[PDB]
Amino acid sequence: SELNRKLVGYFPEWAYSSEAQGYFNVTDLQWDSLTHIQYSFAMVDPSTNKITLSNKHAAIEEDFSEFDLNYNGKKIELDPSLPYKGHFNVLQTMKKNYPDVSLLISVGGWTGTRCFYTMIDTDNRINTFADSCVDFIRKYGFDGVDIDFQYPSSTSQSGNPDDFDLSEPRRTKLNERYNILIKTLREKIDMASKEDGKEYLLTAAVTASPWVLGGISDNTYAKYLDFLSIMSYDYHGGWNEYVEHLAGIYPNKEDRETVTQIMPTLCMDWAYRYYRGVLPAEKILMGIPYYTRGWENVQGGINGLHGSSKTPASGKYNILGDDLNNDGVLEPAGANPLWHVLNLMEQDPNLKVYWDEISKVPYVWQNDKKVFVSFENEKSIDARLEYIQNKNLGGALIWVMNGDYGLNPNYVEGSNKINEGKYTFGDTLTKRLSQGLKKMGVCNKTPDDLNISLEPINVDVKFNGKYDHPNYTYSIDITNYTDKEIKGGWNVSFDLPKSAVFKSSWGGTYSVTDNGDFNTITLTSGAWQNIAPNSTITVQGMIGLCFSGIRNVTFNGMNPIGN
Ligand SMILES: CC(=O)N[C@@H]1[C@@H](O)[C@H](O[C@@H]2O[C@H](CO)[C@@H](O[C@@H]3O[C@H](CO)[C@@H](O)[C@H](O)[C@H]3NC(C)=O)[C@H](O)[C@H]2NC(C)=O)[C@@H](CO)O[C@H]1O
């Protein structure tokens, strides 16, 4: 049911054959605790514009004869009656015992967004892609589609730099074309649901970055999603010098990267406020990382935090680093699954865990080597559960499921091998999240905007603007569709998400009233701003920082229903 809490986990297609990933396969998924599994990743084909597999062998061909498929201590065999093998066979086989766990195919990701740029160029290509998604979920027994386009933004040089040859020429239209993509997917998926007697889902994982969001002008697409997953992680990392939290929850005035900003933006709660402009809390999921980022040779800070470093952590502190040329030399990133950091702490008593009571996340600091790594533990899970309950969030998504921890069957005392430590992957944090989501009960239904309860007036209020970080210059066009002049002194109100701060109205007067996740802005015009019948007047002003949209628009205490 719609208001049930959700615990959504991303499954990595590439993990089962990789030492650093722990050889994690579908039978290692936390099936008793997740409500949804997002298979990562499918992509778009450059020549046909259809959904396509990345590692086809892993997805539908691997027989796992060289790997260990077992669950609850019982050997899992591939279902020999299915016309495919691979992860997809194991997913369908497990789902027979977990029929209420929804399976979605995630399309895109950091390295799989490239061909979205050309597929969105025309409506016929979007239609082909959307139809191919329907065919795919039917063929492979999926319950829905997750779109992970990184990113449909005009912000220059956002997304993967390998794709700038496609994204940079398209910046002005990306957001508009993405809105058409999501709407078309919803239309086709809903038709397939009716035809099949099944309730198929459409979701998206979306940016939490104020930098990316400055280039997003239309968040209407959110209304077409079953839920919207905020990527409230990768806030900080080895791409810059700011030794700060990967995935803080609450705004932290000591985050050195944002100390000059209007408010601290690199935390879940800022993105929550941003997206409340277009969605109720129960349709929003918090993103939770089961991986780390970090730095070495950290200068300054306190236990590293708020320090500086031009050298991301390497070596044993970076087992998930990329090998983008080859021969085992990994790009420094301080990137690890949580179980590996636990094992490092077993090995080194001076690698210690600390708690940030402002951001409500932990971190790990080696004071002799000056190594800082982000972390996630039972205390931060508990803080996240508290936030989910307090804010009425729909639940959480997790990147990525092989990073949770449990006891290692292959532990070897004294061994430094990646998969011979005390811990390997497991379900400790995921079970803790699941138990907490069960205990807090279903979400409340957020009430409709109050403007709908007001008496109607045939006035149209259109809110537009332009963003030049950190300044949003708004223009409101007010059209009088009644048969009488509206005298000057009229007022318009709107609810502005608390991701932004109203700064000034350029004409008339204004007031700001606290209203939950919003401030209600009331603009009162001057006596001279009469609105003749069938005419339009425009008023302007300035807002600091960005917001997904405005809500609850009123005019002279009535609901402006236009013409
Ligand atoms: C035009 C201009 O100078 N704009 C400034 C912004 O760049 C800056 O925001 C920061 O932008 C960088 C990218 O240039 C962001 O880093 C990226 O972060 C993502 C994850 O969020 C990571 O995947 C990328 O690898 C990384 N790229 C690079 C090149 O480092 C950074 O997170 C942004 N920080 C914030 C707080 O938004 C803002 C800062 O306010 O200033 C603009 O003037």
Side-chain angles (χ1 to χ4, degrees), residues 1-73 76-412 414-416 418-465 467-486 488-563:
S1 199
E2 86 178 0
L3 299 172
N4 298 345
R5 305 291 178 159
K6 297 152 239 291
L7 188 55
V8 181
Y10 282 80
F11 174 76
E13 166 177 275
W14 53 90
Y16 79 102
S17 60
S18 164
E19 179 183 9
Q21 305 279 344
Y23 308 108
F24 187 91
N25 65 59
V26 168
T27 67
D28 300 312
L29 274 165
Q30 301 83 350
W31 283 93
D32 293 297
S33 298
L34 298 172
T35 60
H36 300 68
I37 296 164
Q38 302 193 336
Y39 184 94
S40 313
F41 287 110
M43 300 183 309
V44 181
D45 186 88
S47 287
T48 72
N49 292 290
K50 298 172 88 167
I51 190 175
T52 194
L53 299 167
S54 180
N55 186 336
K56 176 188 197 151
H57 175 84
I60 58 165
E61 299 172 346
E62 171 67 62
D63 68 11
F64 302 95
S65 62
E66 301 291 284
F67 304 91
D68 295 319
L69 299 193
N70 65 267
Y71 190 80
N72 288 337
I76 300 299
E77 295 195 76
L78 269 55
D79 184 343
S81 64
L82 291 174
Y84 48 87
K85 295 182 184 186
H87 290 317
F88 286 5
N89 185 305
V90 189
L91 285 168
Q92 293 299 302
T93 301
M94 290 299 293
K95 184 145 155 226
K96 289 143 205 167
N97 293 127
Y98 290 94
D100 294 339
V101 175
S102 297
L103 306 182
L104 293 83
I105 182 61
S106 190
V107 193
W110 182 248
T111 63
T113 289
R114 179 175 178 79
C115 296
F116 276 88
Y117 295 114
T118 48
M119 174 271 291
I120 59 66
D121 277 348
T122 72
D123 292 351
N124 287 334
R125 288 175 181 175
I126 291 180
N127 290 339
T128 292
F129 173 71
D131 284 341
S132 80
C133 288
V134 166
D135 298 342
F136 182 101
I137 65 177
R138 283 170 166 165
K139 182 176 188 172
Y140 293 122
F142 279 95
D143 298 300
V145 177
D146 178 61
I147 299 296
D148 182 9
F149 187 145
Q150 297 180 192
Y151 301 97
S153 173
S154 73
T155 295
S156 177
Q157 301 154 59
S158 62
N160 193 318
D162 291 342
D163 301 333
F164 287 169
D165 61 323
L166 304 184
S167 59
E168 288 291 294
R170 293 174 170 77
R171 290 300 180 187
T172 64
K173 71 178 193 187
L174 283 181
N175 176 221
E176 178 189 329
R177 302 301 299 166
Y178 177 81
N179 272 277
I180 295 166
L181 169 65
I182 298 302
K183 177 176 179 287
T184 302
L185 281 160
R186 170 53 65 177
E187 288 167 353
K188 306 291 197 145
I189 292 168
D190 278 1
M191 283 299 297
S193 292
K194 289 179 179 68
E195 296 175 354
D196 297 352
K198 247 187 103 170
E199 291 259 52
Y200 295 124
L201 304 173
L202 176 64
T203 65
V206 305
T207 187
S209 168
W211 172 64
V212 180
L213 289 168
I216 289 166
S217 56
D218 179 7
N219 289 284
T220 298
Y221 69 86
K223 86 180 182 105
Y224 295 115
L225 305 177
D226 291 283
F227 53 82
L228 175 133
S229 290
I230 297 177
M231 309 170 85
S232 45
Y233 41 72
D234 282 355
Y235 281 128
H236 286 293
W239 48 85
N240 71 30
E241 64 160 277
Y242 297 107
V243 180
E244 298 287 344
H245 296 305
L246 180 70
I249 302 169
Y250 297 98
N252 192 327
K253 295 171 174 182
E254 299 180 49
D255 184 335
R256 281 201 314 124
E257 188 166 349
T258 57
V259 66
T260 70
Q261 300 289 301
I262 290 164
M263 65 185 83
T265 49
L266 302 176
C267 63
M268 165 70 194
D269 183 67
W270 182 87
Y272 167 75
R273 284 174 272 132
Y274 175 93
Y275 283 108
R276 280 287 286 118
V278 295
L279 284 176
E282 62 266 25
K283 285 188 75 197
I284 296 172
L285 309 189
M286 171 191 289
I288 305 180
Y290 288 171
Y291 68 98
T292 69
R293 293 186 183 278
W295 297 260
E296 59 197 19
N297 207 24
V298 174
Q299 305 297 302
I302 300 167
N303 311 318
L305 185 64
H306 311 310
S308 183
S309 169
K310 64 164 206 97
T311 57
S314 67
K316 72 187 182 187
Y317 303 110
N318 188 42
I319 66 164
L320 302 180
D322 289 333
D323 197 348
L324 282 191
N325 224 346
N326 221 287
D327 203 49
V329 180
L330 310 185
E331 191 67 57
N336 306 283
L338 303 181
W339 45 265
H340 179 62
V341 175
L342 290 173
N343 290 337
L344 291 177
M345 293 193 286
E346 296 293 313
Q347 296 164 20
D348 182 358
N350 292 294
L351 186 65
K352 301 181 185 182
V353 68
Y354 295 88
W355 176 248
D356 186 324
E357 82 167 339
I358 303 303
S359 295
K360 298 210 184 307
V361 286
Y363 56 103
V364 170
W365 172 244
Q366 222 289 357
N367 193 46
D368 297 324
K369 296 172 198 159
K370 309 301 179 179
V371 172
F372 176 104
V373 183
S374 67
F375 200 51
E376 194 73 47
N377 64 10
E378 291 86 351
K379 200 166 176 70
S380 59
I381 288 309
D382 289 354
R384 292 179 186 284
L385 287 166
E386 175 183 37
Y387 186 97
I388 288 163
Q389 185 171 8
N390 290 344
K391 267 69 177 75
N392 198 48
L393 291 191
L397 69 150
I398 301 161
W399 183 269
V400 53
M401 293 318 298
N402 66 325
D404 199 355
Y405 66 92
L407 296 181
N408 187 6
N410 303 130
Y411 166 74
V412 177
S415 176
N416 275 12
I418 286 169
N419 294 295
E420 295 182 348
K422 176 174 181 173
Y423 298 98
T424 186
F425 55 76
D427 74 341
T428 302
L429 298 186
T430 305
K431 183 181 285 182
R432 192 177 188 93
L433 282 163
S434 169
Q435 288 293 106
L437 294 168
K438 285 169 178 176
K439 192 188 206 176
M440 65 177 71
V442 301
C443 293
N444 299 132
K445 180 76 180 185
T446 295
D448 287 350
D449 287 3
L450 290 192
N451 69 306
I452 292 297
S453 68
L454 302 176
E455 293 302 316
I457 188 163
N458 285 108
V459 168
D460 185 73
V461 178
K462 191 180 179 190
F463 184 97
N464 290 328
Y467 193 61
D468 187 4
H469 183 84
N471 297 329
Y472 191 94
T473 300
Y474 69 82
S475 298
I476 301 174
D477 298 324
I478 302 184
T479 304
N480 175 9
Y481 284 112
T482 80
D483 68 2
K484 289 185 297 184
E485 185 183 62
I486 296 169
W490 53 261
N491 74 95
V492 63
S493 83
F494 61 93
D495 288 2
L496 180 65
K498 284 176 170 180
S499 57
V501 178
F502 189 86
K503 299 293 183 64
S504 56
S505 171
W506 302 348
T509 58
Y510 70 94
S511 65
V512 183
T513 301
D514 179 288
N515 191 26
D517 298 328
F518 313 90
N519 289 111
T520 299
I521 310 303
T522 304
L523 306 176
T524 299
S525 65
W528 61 277
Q529 289 166 287
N530 307 294
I531 321 179
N534 193 242
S535 72
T536 300
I537 190 180
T538 298
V539 297
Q540 297 191 296
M542 185 147 278
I543 290 158
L545 269 167
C546 51
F547 48 94
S548 63
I550 63 157
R551 299 180 165 277
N552 190 30
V553 176
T554 75
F555 183 87
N556 280 1
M558 293 167 69
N559 182 17
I561 57 166
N563 209 21

